[PDB]
């Protein structure tokens, strides 16, 4: 029900979509062709920008299946997209396989985007946890 | 209070359990014996299947403590278990240590499973973020 | 609005803070000087302890930007801080770059802490998912 406004910065890519109604995330595609040699990383453009609602957070997870099979991961997983970030979502892909290079083609699914509420907690410093109402 | 129906596909393993009432996750065990050489990964069976409620998501995190001490991690962390996935939870374990192999014994805790609500957002494409009601 | 009681175990470090009102996390600093050689990891002290509310969970994510640029990651990401954990938050940093060492200085931002609600689900074992009220 909650709406996620999304802009296809690169109109040549398919609009991300939820494969199944209950799926936690939507796959993001790569806007560029990139080849990751064993152990190497790259900041890859997804060609999309989103407006995560205040009080929520966008999270970029690596995909399972073949992606995991070949050792594709994300350096800063879970990628954190803040409510105020309106820029292009980029994925810090990293090939965790010791010998087999990973070839990323433009249009390839490289990650999945989830949206969850986040507790924008107010940090209150205390000398110790022996505080009433902790 | 929310219920998580779980099936022990492998009855020989202990039923996952929450060590402490407030703990975010429950440890999942390995149904198989596997030895991860430095830098190598493996898709390991947990011997369990769960029914994550619609509107929620199951998340598989690496464990802290000794697991972290030896460099055990998860390729696609956080492992994403969708509300519709009723299959066996498998963990893409990876030994991130450069020289010390990691031996996983059947019955060993290999990860922890958390359950959180997820915002099944409806993506609405827009030409730009200069939209009323964004 | 939700309060997060925090103790600066090391008073010499800045109190973690939310850079922007809607930011999902607050940066945690390193209380120690540490140099991570390529592929090596270390359990680094943040000099802070927090009281995550019951029903919630603290999550430690790697930071984006330069941190990702140099290949700094977290072995057990997302770091899971349970509601009952009142000890010092430590970050299992790992240099995922193959050749460039990462130098962590005392006072350097090494990760970000988020707080989210977590479903403290009650696991109910079932022989199969063909259960009424699943």
DSSP-assigned letters across all residues of chain C: --EEEEEESSTTSPPP--SSTT-SEEEEE-SS-EEE-TT-EEEEEEEEEEEPPTTEEEEEE---THHHHTTEEETTSSEEE-TT--SEEEEEEEE--SS--EEEPTT-EEEEEEEEE---PEEEE-SSS--TT-
Contact C80, B64 (CB under 8 A): yes
A80 is in an annotated binding site: yes
Judged by a CB distance cut-off of 8 A, whether residue B65 touches chain C is no
Buried (b) or exposed (e) across B6-17, using 16+ Cβ within 10 A?
Answer: bbbebeebeebe
Rounded distance, CA A6 to CA A58, Å?
12
The CA distances from residue B103 to B5, B73, B74, B92, in Å, are: 30, 13, 15, 14
Pull the structure tokens for residue A47: 């060609």
Cβ of C122 within 8 Å of Cβ of B17? The answer is no
Residue A5, beta-bridge partner list: A51, B124
Contact C119, B116 (CB under 8 A): yes
The CA distances from residue A30 to A45, A59, A92, in Å, are: 6, 17, 11
Q: Within its chain, how far is the Cα of B3 from the centroid?
A: 18
Nearest CA distance, B13 vs chain A (angstrom): 25
Residue C29's contacts (CB-CB under 8 Å, 6 or more residues apart) are: C13, C14, C16, C46, C47, C107, C108, C109, C110
State whether the Cα torsion B35-B16-B48-A117 is positive or negative. Answer: negative
Residue C132's contacts (CB-CB under 8 Å, 6 or more residues apart) are: none
Rounded distance, CA A81 to CA A56, Å?
9
B14 phi-psi bin (left φ>0, alpha ψ -120 to 50, beta other): beta
Domain ranges in chain A are 1-134
Pull the structure tokens for residue C31: 């209380």
**DSSP 8-state symbol, B56:** E
Contact C46, B31 (CB under 8 A): no
Comparing CB atoms, the residue among B21, B22, B71 nearest residue C75 is B71
Rounded distance, CA A109 to CA A107, Å?
7
Judged by a CB distance cut-off of 8 A, whether residue C62 touches chain A is yes
Give the pairing type, strands B41-51 and A25-29: unpaired
Mutation test of the interface with chain A: which of B84, B101, B113, B119, choosing the one with the most A Cβ atoms within 10 A?
B119
Rounded distance, CA A59 to CA C24, Å?
10
Rounded distance, CA C129 to CA B9, Å?
11
Rounded distance, CA C5 to CA C53, Å?
9
Give the pairing type, strands A72-74 and A88-95: antiparallel
Resolution at which this structure was determined, Å: 2.0
Rounded distance, CA C85 to CA C113, Å?
14
Residue A113, beta-bridge partner list: A26, A60
Residue A13, beta-bridge partner list: none
Q: Which residue of B has its CA nearest to A78?
A: B78
Contact A7, A31 (CB under 8 A): no
Rounded distance, CA A110 to CA A11, Å?
17
Give me the torsion for CA of A122, A125, A129, A132, rounded to 10°. -70
Sort out which chain A residues have CB atoms less than 8 A from B122's CB and list them: 1-4
Counting one residue from chain A and one from chain B, the pairs whose CB atoms sit within 8 A come to 110
Judged by a CB distance cut-off of 8 A, whether residue A101 touches chain C is no
Pull the structure tokens for residue C132: 């009424």
Single out the residue of A82, A71, A65 nearest to residue A27, CA to CA.
Answer: A65
Give the pairing type, strands A122-125 and C3-8: parallel
C:68-97 residues touching chain B, CB 8 A cutoff: 75-80, 82-84, 92, 94
Rounded distance, CA A19 to CA A16, Å?
9
Sort out which chain A residues have CB atoms less than 8 A from C73's CB and list them: 75-76
Counting one residue from chain B and one from chain C, the pairs whose CB atoms sit within 8 A come to 110
State which approach was used to obtain the coordinates: X-ray
Judged by a CB distance cut-off of 8 A, whether residue A133 touches chain B is no
Superfamily in which the A1-134 domain is placed by CATH: Deoxyuridine triphosphatase (dUTPase) (2.70.40.10)
Cβ of B82 within 8 Å of Cβ of A23? The answer is yes
Comparing CB atoms, the residue among C7, C20, C115 nearest residue A121 is C115
Mutation test of the interface with chain B: which of A22, A49, A57, A86, choosing the one with the most B Cβ atoms within 10 A?
A22
Rounded distance, CA A96 to CA B40, Å?
9
Nearest CA distance, A96 vs chain C (angstrom): 9
The count of other CB atoms within 10 Å of the CB of residue B3 is 14
Judged by a CB distance cut-off of 8 A, whether residue B131 touches chain A is yes
User: Peptide bond preceding B23: is omega within 30 degrees of 0, i.e. cis?
Assistant: no
The CA distances from residue B76 to A44, C65, C79, in Å, are: 17, 20, 14
Rounded distance, CA B18 to CA B87, Å?
21
- Tokens 């009281």 appear where? C51
Sort out which chain A residues have CB atoms less than 8 A from B134's CB and list them: 5, 51
Pull the structure tokens for residue B26: 């429950």
């Amino acid at each position: 029900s909650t709406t996620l406004a999304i802009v296809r910065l690169d109109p040549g890519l398919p609009l991300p979509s939820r494969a199944h109604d209950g799926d936690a995330g939507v796959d993001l595609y790569s806007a560029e062709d990139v080849e990751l040699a064993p152990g190497r990383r790259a900041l890859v453009r997804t060609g999309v920008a989103v407006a995560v609602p205040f009080g929520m957070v966008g999270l970029v997870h690596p995909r399972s299946g073949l992606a995991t099979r070949v050792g594709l991961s994300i350096v800063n997983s879970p990628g954190t997209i803040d409510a105020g970030y309106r820029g292009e979502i980029k994925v810090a892909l990293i090939n965790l396989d010791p010998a087999a290079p990973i070839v990323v083609h433009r249009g390839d699914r490289i990650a999945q985007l989830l949206v969850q509420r986040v507790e924008l907690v107010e940090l209150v410093e205390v000398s110790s946890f022996d505080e009433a109402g902790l």
